[PDB]
Amino acid sequence: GRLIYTAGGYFRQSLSYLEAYNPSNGSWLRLADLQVPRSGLAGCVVGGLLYAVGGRNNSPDGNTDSSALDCYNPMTNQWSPCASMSVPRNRIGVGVIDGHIYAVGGSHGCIHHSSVERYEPERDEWHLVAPMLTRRIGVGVAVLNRLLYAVGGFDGTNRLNSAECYYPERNEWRMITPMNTIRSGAGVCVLHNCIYAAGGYDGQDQLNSVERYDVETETWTFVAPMRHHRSALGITVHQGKIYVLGGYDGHTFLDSVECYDPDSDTWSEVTRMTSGRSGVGVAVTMEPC
Numbered sequence: 513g514r515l516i517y518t519a520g521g522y523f524r525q526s527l528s529y530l531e532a533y534n535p536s537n538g539s540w541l542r543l544a545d546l547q548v549p550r551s552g553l554a555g556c557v558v559g560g561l562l563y564a565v566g567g568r569n570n571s572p573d574g575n576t577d578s579s580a581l582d583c584y585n586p587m588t589n590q591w592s593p594c595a596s597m598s599v600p601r602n603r604i605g606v607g608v609i610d611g612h613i614y615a616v617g618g619s620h621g622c623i624h625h626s627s628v629e630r631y632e633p634e635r636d637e638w639h640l641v642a643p644m645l646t647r648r649i650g651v652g653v654a655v656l657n658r659l660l661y662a663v664g665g666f667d668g669t670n671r672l673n674s675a676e677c678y679y680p681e682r683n684e685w686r687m688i689t690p691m692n693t694i695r696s697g698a699g700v701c702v703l704h705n706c707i708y709a710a711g712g713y714d715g716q717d718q719l720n721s722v723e724r725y726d727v728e729t730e731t732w733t734f735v736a737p738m739r740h741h742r743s744a745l746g747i748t749v750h751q752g753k754i755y756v757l758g759g760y761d762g763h764t765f766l767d768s769v770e771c772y773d774p775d776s777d778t779w780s781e782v783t784r785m786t787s788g789r790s791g792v793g794v795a796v797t798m799e800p801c
């Protein structure tokens with residue numbers, strides 16, 4: 513059995529929560545807290561281990577952007593620090609290729625990063641790679657066919673409809689077709705042969721719209737919209753379905769979890785997080801024992 517893990521997030525301040533939702537039975541487990549509260553982080557899994565990457569501790573006692581990489585082992589229910597990134601990256605995106613973690617973009621104070629770096633678990637080492645063509649914070653990241661895509665975000669001045677693709681064997685970024693919608697702090701994931709971008713902020717409104725990029729056709733197509741408008745949502749795939757978790761709708765820090773069924777093109781309410789929050793990190797791995 514596999515669980516959807518949600519790490520960190522934001523309500524009033526950055527959160528240390530780690531909780532795991534089991535689609536098979538509707539249940540939530542609270543697991544070991546993050547060592548450091550963080551919002552605007554990303555989650556990913558490599559070799560059954562859950563990693564929490566970047567973010568920011570927004571707290572009454574000060575605000576600190578995170579360069580941290582921390583590893584959670586479901587077998588032990590324990591967090592362990594890994595090597596830190598070259599730079600703090602709040603509102604980061606991440607993707608895994610070939611057992612390596614790419615950390616993309618994000619902010620450090622007023623610095624909006626185009627830089628990108630790659631973590632090798634076997635070596636506990638980060639190394640910089642080619643930077644993106646654009647500065648992107650609140651960037652959506654997905655991996656399809658061992659290529660890494662960076663989608664939308666905020667460049668320090670404008671929210672972006674643009675997207676680009678990183679070709680590892682050439683260490684090179686190239687623009688792809690722009691989305692039909694400006695999206696920053698969207699949820700971005702892969703399903704089948706498509707990159708999905710769900711929600712985000714366009715500069716004026718939180719979005720419910722959802723569109724997908726087909727790598728073979730190089731075009732974006734809208735699918736059915738989510739039931740909730742949301743920016744700073746978490747997103748993941750579990751058994752061929754997209755799940756979106758939390759976010760901010762302009763009014764409420766959402767506890768809503770929705771899932772998308774591509775065959776019926778419908779979104780439905782699935783469960784509620786134990787408390788409303790935005791800016792979480794999400795990934796899927798094995799049950800704790």
Ligand SMILES: CN(C)C(=O)c1cccc(-c2cccc(-n3ncc(C(=O)O)c3C(F)(F)F)n2)c1
Binds near residue numbers: 552697698
């Ligand atoms: C209302 N608040 C501030 C929160 O709910 C919140 C709190 C902490 C972290 C984030 C977050 C997480 C991931 C991406 C983003 N970005 N990154 C860029 C933009 C943009 O405006 O362009 C956004 C946002 F806020 F929409 F979603 N934010 C949002």
Ligand SMILES: [Cl-]
Binds near residue numbers: 552568602
């Ligand atoms: Cl923030």
